[PDB]
Amino acid sequence: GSYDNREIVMKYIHYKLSQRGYEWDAGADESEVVHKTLREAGDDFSRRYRRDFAEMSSQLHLTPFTARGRFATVVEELFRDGVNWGRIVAFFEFGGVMCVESVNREMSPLVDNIALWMTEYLNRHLHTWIQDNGGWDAFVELYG
Ligand SMILES: O=C(c1cc(-c2cc3c(cc2C(=O)N2Cc4ccccc4C[C@H]2CN2CCOCC2)OCO3)n2c1CCCC2)N(c1ccccc1)c1ccc(O)cc1
């Protein structure tokens, strides 16, 4: 199947933020299994690297004017050597962490921007690989 990558991003971020006590109203609402499997994969990745995640918080020092550069720098590093599902999970978890950090640092408007930046990058740079590699349904089989 083929999905709406914007919807995948928005659902992923909205859930992560709602869990943590922020209702992201600007971003409020086979597909179902994709959303759930991606969330669980990201949570597994967060657990797997729990202490590196904890530590990362201090590394980024986000501000509105630097946030895009900080985001893009990491995304470029993640995919410099090509695409695979692991790096896609890392990309979703990184975006989600950036949204949580934006809320925590009293910069909640950045959530909307991060969601856009993630969607643009999926659209432009990852979708061909996803489609070629069996789509999100292949991800579900591999991670489910
Ligand atoms: O710089 C990064 C980062 C995270 C990964 C990464 C991606 C993966 C993965 C693995 C790692 C990884 O390399 N780590 C995971 C991790 C997780 C959380 C925080 C830091 C790190 C760094 C190291 C952990 N080390 C690796 C060597 O052995 C000891 C543990 O398996 C599947 O996909 N990679 C990078 C940079 C480029 C190589 C891969 N972040 C980053 C971003 C901002 C600031 C600092 C680091 C980043 C990117 C995406 C994320 O979801 C989270 C982190």
Residue numbers in the entry: 7 to 35, 48 to 50, 92 to 203
What does the paper say about this structure?
BCL-2 family proteins are divided into 3 functionally distinct groups: (i) the pro-survival proteins (BCL-2, BCL-XL, BCL-W, MCL-1 and BFL-1/BCL2A1/A1), (ii) the multi-BH domain cell death effectors (BAX, BAK, BOK) and (iii) the BH3-only apoptosis initiators (e.g. BIM, BAD, NOXA).
Here we describe S55746 (also known as BCL201), a novel, orally active BCL-2 specific inhibitor that has a partially overlapping but distinct BCL-2 hydrophobic groove binding mode compared to ABT-199. Fluorescence polarization (FP) data, using Fluorescent-PUMA as a binder, demonstrates that S55746 is a potent inhibitor of BCL-2 (Ki = 1.3 nM). The selectivity of S55746 for BCL-2 versus BCL-XL ranges from ~70 to 400 folds depending on the assay used. No significant binding to MCL-1 and BFL-1 was observed. S55746 occupies the region typically referred to as S1/2/3 in contrast to the ABT-199 analog, which occupies a greater portion of the protein surface area including S2/3/4/5. S55746 adopts essentially the same binding mode as described in Porter et al. 2009. S55746 forms a single hydrogen bond to the backbone carbonyl of residue A149 buried deep into S2. The size-independent enthalpic efficiency (0.83) for S55746 binding to BCL-2 is suggestive of optimal polar and Van der Waal's interactions, indicative of highly specific binding. Since ABT-199 and S55746 have different binding modes, one can theoretically speculate that mutation(s) in the BCL-2 protein could cause resistance to one compound and not the other. Altogether, these data demonstrate that S55746 kills cancer cells through on-target activity, meaning activation of a BAX/BAK-dependent mitochondrial apoptotic pathway by direct inhibition of the BCL-2 pro-survival protein.
